[PDB]
mmCIF file of C-alpha atoms in Angstrom:
data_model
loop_
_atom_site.group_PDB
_atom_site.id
_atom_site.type_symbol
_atom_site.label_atom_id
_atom_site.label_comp_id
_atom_site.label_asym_id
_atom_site.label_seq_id
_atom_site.Cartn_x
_atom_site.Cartn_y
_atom_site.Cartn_z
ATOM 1 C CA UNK F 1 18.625 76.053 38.207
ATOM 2 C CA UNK F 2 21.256 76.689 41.014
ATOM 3 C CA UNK F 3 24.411 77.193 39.583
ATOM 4 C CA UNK F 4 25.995 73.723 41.704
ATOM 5 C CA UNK F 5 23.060 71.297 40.543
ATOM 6 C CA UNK F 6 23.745 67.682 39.432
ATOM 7 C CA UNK F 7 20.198 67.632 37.727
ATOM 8 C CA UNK F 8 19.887 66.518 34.233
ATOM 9 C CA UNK F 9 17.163 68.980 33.129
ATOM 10 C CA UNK F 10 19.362 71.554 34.599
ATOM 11 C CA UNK K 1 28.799 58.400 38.442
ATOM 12 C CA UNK K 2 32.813 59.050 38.323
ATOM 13 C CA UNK K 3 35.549 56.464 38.824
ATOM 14 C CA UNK K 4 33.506 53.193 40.903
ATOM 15 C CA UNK K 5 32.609 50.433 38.707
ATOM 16 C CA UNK K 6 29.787 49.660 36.300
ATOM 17 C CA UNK K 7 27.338 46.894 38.530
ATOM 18 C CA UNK K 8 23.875 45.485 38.187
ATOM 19 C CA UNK K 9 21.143 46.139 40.428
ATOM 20 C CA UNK K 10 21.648 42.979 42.970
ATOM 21 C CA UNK K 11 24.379 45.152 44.736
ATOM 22 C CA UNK K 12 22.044 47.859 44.775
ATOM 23 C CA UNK K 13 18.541 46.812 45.094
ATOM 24 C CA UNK K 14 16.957 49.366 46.453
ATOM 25 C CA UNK K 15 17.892 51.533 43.524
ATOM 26 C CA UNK K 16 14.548 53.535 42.002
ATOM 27 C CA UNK K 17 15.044 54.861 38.255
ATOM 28 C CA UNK K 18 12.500 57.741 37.641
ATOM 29 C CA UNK K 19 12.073 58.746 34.629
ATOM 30 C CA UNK K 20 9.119 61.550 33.350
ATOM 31 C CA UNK K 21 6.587 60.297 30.698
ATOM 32 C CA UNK K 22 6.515 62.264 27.113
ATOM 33 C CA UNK K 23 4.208 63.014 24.547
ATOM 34 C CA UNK K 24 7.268 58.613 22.862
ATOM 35 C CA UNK K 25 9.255 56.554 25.609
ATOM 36 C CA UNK K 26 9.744 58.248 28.667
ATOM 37 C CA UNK K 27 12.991 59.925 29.463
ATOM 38 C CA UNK K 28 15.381 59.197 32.911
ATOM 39 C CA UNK K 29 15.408 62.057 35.121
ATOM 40 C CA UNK K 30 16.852 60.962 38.482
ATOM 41 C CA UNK K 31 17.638 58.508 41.184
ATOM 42 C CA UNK K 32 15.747 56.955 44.034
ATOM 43 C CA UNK K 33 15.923 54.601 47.247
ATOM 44 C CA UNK K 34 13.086 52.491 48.242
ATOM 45 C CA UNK K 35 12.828 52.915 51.490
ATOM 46 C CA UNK K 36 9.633 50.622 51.957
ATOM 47 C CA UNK K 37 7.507 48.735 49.387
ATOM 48 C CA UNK K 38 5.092 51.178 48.735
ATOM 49 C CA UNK K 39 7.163 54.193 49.371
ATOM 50 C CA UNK K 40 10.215 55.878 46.983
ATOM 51 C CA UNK K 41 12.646 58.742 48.519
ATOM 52 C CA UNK K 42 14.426 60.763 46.120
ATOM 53 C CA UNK K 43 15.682 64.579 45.403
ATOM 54 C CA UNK K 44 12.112 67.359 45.583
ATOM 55 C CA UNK K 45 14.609 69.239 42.619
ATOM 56 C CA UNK K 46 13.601 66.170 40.498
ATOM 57 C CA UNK K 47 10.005 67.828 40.270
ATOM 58 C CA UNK K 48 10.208 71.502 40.277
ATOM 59 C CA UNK K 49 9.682 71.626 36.625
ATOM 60 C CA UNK K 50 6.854 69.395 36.797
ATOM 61 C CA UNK K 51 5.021 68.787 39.978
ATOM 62 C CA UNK K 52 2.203 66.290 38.749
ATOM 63 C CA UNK K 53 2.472 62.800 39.495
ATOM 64 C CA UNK K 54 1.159 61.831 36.461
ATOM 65 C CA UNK K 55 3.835 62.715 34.600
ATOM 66 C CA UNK K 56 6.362 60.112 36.191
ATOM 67 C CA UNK K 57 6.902 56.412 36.135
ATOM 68 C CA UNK K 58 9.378 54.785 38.373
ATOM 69 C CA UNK K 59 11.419 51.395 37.626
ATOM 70 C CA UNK K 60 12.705 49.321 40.574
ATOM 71 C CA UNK K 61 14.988 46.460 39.556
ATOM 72 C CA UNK K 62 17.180 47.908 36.731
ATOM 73 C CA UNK K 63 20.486 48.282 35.657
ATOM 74 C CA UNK K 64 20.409 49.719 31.968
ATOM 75 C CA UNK K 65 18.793 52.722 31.908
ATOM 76 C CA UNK K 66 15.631 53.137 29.261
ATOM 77 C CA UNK K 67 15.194 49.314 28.216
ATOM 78 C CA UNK K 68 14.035 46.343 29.362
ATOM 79 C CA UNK K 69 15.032 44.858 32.992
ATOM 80 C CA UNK K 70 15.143 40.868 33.454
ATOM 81 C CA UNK K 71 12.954 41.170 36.776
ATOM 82 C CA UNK K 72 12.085 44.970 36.502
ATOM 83 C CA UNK K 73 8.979 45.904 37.919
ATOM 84 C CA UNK K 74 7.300 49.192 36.670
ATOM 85 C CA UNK K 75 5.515 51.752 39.265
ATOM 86 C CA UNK K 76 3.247 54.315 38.865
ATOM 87 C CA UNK K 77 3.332 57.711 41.218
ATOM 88 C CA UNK K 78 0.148 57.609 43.024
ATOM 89 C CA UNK K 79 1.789 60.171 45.766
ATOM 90 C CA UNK K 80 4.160 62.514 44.690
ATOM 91 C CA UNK K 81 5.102 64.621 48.120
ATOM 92 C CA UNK K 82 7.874 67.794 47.854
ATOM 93 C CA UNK K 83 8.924 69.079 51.141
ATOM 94 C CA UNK K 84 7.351 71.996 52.426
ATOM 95 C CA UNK K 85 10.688 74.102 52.752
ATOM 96 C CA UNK K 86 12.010 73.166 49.694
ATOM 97 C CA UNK K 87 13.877 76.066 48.020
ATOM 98 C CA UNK K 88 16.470 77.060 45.614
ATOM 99 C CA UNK K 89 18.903 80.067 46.306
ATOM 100 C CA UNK K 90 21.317 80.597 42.722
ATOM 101 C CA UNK K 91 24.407 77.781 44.404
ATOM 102 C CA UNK K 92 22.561 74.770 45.767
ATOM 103 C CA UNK K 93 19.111 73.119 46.390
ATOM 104 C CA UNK K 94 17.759 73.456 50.434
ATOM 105 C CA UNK K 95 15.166 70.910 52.047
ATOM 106 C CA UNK K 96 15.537 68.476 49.049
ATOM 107 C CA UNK K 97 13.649 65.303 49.702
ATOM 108 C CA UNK K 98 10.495 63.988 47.808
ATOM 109 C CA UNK K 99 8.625 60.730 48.691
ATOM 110 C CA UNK K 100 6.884 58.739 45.685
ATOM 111 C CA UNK K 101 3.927 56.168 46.327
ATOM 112 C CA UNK K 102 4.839 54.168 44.213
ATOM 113 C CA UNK K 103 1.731 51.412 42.623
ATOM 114 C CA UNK K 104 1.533 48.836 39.546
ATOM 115 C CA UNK K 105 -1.353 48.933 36.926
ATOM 116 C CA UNK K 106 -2.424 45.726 39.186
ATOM 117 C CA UNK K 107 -2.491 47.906 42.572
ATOM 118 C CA UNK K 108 1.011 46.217 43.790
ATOM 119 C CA UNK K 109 3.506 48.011 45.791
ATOM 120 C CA UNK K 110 7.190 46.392 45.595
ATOM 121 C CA UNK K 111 8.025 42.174 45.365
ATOM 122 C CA UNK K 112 11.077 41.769 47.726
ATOM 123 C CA UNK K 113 13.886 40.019 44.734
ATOM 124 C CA UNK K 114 17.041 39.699 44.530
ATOM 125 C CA UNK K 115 17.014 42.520 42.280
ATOM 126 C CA UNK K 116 14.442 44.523 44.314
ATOM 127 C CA UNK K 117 15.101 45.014 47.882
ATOM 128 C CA UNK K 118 14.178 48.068 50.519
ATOM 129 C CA UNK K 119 16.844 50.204 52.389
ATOM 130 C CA UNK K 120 17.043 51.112 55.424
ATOM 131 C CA UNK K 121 16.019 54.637 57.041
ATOM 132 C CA UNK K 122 18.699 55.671 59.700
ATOM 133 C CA UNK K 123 18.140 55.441 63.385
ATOM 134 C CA UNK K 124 17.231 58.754 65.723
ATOM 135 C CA UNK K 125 20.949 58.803 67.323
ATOM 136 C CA UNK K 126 23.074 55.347 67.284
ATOM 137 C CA UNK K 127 25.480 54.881 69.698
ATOM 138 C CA UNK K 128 28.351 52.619 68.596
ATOM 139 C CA UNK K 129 30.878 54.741 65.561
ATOM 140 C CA UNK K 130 30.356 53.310 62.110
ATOM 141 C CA UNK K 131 32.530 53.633 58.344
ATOM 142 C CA UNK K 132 31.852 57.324 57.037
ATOM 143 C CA UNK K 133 33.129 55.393 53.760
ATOM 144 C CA UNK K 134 29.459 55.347 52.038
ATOM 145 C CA UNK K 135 28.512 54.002 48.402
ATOM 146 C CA UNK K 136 26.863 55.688 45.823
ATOM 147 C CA UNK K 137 25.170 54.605 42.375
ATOM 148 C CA UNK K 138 23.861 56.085 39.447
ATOM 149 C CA UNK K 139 23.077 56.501 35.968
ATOM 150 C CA UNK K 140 24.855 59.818 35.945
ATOM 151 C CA UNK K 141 27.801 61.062 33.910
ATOM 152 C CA UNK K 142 31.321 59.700 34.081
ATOM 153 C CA UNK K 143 33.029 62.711 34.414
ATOM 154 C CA UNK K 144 31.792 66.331 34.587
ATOM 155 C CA UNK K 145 32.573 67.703 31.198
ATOM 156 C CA UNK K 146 31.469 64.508 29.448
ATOM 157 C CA UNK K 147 28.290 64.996 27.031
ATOM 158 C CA UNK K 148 26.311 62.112 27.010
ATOM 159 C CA UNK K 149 25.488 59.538 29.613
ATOM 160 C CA UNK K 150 26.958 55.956 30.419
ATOM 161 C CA UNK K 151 23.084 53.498 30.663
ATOM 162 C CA UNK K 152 24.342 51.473 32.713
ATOM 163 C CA UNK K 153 24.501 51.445 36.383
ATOM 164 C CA UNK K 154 27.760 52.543 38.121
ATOM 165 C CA UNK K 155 28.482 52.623 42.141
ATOM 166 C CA UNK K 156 31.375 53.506 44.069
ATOM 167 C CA UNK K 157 32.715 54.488 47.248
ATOM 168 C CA UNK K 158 33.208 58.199 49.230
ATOM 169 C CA UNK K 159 34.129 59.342 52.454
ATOM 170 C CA UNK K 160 31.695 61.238 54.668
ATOM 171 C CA UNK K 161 33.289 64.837 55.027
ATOM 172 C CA UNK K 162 32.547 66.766 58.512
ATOM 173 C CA UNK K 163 30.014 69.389 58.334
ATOM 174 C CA UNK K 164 32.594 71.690 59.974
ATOM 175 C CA UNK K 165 35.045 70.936 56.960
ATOM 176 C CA UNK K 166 32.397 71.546 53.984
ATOM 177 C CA UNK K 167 31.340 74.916 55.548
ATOM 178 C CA UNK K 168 35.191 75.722 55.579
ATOM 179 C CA UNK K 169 35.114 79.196 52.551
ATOM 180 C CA UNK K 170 37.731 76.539 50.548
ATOM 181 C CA UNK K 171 34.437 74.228 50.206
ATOM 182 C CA UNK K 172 30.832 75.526 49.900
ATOM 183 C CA UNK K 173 31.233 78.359 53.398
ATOM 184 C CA UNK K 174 28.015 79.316 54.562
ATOM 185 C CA UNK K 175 25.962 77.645 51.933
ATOM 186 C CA UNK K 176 26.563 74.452 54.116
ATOM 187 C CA UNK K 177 24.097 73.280 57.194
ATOM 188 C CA UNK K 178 23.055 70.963 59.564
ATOM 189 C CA UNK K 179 20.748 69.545 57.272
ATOM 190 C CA UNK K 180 23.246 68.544 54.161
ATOM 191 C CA UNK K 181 25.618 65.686 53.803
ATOM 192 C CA UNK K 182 28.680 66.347 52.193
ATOM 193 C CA UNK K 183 30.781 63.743 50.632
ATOM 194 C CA UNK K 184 34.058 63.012 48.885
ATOM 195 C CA UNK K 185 36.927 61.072 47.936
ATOM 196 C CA UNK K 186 40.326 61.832 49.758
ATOM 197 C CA UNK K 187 41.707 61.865 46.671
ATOM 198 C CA UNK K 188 38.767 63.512 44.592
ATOM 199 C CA UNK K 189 39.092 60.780 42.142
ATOM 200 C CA UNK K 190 35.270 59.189 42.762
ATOM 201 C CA UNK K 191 31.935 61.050 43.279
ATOM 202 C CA UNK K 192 28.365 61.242 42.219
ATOM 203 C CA UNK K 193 27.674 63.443 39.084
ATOM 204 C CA UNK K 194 25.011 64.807 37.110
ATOM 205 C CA UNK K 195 22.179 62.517 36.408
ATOM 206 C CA UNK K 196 22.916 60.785 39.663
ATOM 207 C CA UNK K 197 20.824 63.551 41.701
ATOM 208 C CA UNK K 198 17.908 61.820 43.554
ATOM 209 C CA UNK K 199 20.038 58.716 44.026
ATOM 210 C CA UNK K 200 20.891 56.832 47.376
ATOM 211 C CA UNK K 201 24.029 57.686 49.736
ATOM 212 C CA UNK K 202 24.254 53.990 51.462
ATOM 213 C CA UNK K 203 26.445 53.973 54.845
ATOM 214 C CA UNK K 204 26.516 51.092 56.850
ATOM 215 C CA UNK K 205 25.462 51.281 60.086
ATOM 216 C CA UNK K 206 24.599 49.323 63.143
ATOM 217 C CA UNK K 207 25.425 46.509 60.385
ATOM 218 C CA UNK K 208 22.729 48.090 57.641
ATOM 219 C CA UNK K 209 22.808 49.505 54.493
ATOM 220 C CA UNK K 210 21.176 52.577 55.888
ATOM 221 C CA UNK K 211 19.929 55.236 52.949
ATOM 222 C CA UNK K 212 22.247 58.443 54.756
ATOM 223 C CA UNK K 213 21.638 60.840 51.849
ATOM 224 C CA UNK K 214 20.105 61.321 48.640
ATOM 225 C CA UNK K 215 22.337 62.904 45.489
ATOM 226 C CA UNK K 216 21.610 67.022 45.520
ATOM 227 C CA UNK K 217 24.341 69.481 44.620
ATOM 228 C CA UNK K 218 27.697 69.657 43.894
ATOM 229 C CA UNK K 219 29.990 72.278 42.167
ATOM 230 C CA UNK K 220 31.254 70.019 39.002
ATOM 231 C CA UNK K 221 31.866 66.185 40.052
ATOM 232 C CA UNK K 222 34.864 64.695 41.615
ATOM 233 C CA UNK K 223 36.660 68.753 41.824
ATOM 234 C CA UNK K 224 38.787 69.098 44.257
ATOM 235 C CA UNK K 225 37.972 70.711 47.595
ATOM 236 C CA UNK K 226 33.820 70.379 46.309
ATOM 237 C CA UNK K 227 32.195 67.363 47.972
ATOM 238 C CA UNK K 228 29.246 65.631 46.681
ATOM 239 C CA UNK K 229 26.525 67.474 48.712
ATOM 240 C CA UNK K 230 23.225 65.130 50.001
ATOM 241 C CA UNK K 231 20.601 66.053 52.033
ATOM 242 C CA UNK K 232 20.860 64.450 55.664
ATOM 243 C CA UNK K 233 18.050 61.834 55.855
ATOM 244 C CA UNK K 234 18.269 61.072 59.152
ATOM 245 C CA UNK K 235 17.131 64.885 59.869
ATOM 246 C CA UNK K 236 13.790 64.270 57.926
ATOM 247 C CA UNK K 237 12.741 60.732 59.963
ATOM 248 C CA UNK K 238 9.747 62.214 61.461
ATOM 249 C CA UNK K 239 8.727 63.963 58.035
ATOM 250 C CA UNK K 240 9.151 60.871 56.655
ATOM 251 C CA UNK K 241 7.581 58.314 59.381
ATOM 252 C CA UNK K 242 4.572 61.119 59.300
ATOM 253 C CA UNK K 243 3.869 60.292 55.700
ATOM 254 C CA UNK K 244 4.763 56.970 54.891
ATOM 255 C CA UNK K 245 3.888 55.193 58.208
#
């Protein structure tokens, strides 16, 4: 996971 | 989705809700745009952790997340395509775009409803200036230190920000290019968040909602001097005509 995702598994 | 509104699914009908199947209802994972009735766009990062198509089933028509939608109609992935270059690099996602072919237990693709509409893919150039005010919509988080998640839909409004701007150190410096979208409000007061990531970025143009990004990175939500960052559709028409068509 990049540190700037807007992912919910992240 | 911060600051906007809370809406149903008529002002954004083109809205896909993907959610991964468990082992036992499945769980929401992302956004999506249908961008014609057989064929889903959303964010490749939605995936990564799961590649199989199986493993997904995609709800056009909704707008409370994980029940029951007056007019919903239920997909199944019988394509699930991740662009070649996709990549991660420790900040942001690169390349991220995914196309879902999307099919009913019956073999349908999408019924055009009120509820359930395609969006349009941008043209190769346009000449003519449109709004760089664009709206986005979710089932992602209010604000970015909020636990928990809001079930119903939200949209809102942002302001296209110049590539030249986002690359500027203050922003996101070199991780920005060519092929990313940023976004934000002039007063950093509205933006997408987490949980909206796959979701549509709807400009209008040559008088059409026209599908301009899709939800990817961002450092926080709605921080000042950090645009919502969306990967630049209209640089992927060919991969996606080559595909879909």
């Amino acid at each position: 996971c990049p540190a700037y995702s807007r992912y919910i598994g992240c | 989705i911060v600051g906007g509104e809370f809406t149903e699914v008529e002002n954004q009908p083109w809205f896909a809700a993907i959610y991964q199947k468990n082992k036992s209802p499945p769980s929401f994972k992302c956004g999506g745009s249908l961008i014609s009735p057989c064929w889903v766009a959303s964010a490749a990062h939605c995936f990564i952790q799961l590649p199989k198509k199986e493993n997904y089933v995609v709800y056009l028509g909704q707008s409370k997340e994980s029940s029951y939608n007056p007019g919903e109609m239920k997909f199944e992935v019988e394509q699930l395509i991740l662009h070649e270059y996709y990549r991660e690099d420790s900040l942001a996602y690169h390349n991220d775009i995914a196309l879902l072919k999307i099919r009913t237990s019956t073999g349908q693709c999408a019924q055009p409803s009120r509820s359930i509409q395609t969006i349009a893919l941008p043209p190769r150039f346009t000449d003519a200036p449109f709004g760089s005010d664009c709206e986005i919509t979710g089932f992602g988080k209010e604000s970015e230190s909020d636990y928990l998640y809001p079930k119903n839909l939200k949209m809102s409004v942002v302001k296209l920000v110049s590539h030249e701007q986002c690359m500027q150190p203050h922003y996101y410096g070199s991780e920005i290019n060519y092929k990313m979208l940023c976004a934000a409000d002039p007063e950093w007061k509205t933006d997408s968040c987490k949980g909206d990531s796959g979701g549509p970025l709807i400009c209008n143009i040559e008088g059409r909602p026209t599908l301009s990004g899709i939800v990817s990175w961002g450092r926080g939500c709605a921080e000042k001097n950090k645009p919502g960052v969306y990967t630049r559709v209209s640089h992927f028409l060919d991969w996606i005509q080559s595909h879909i068509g």
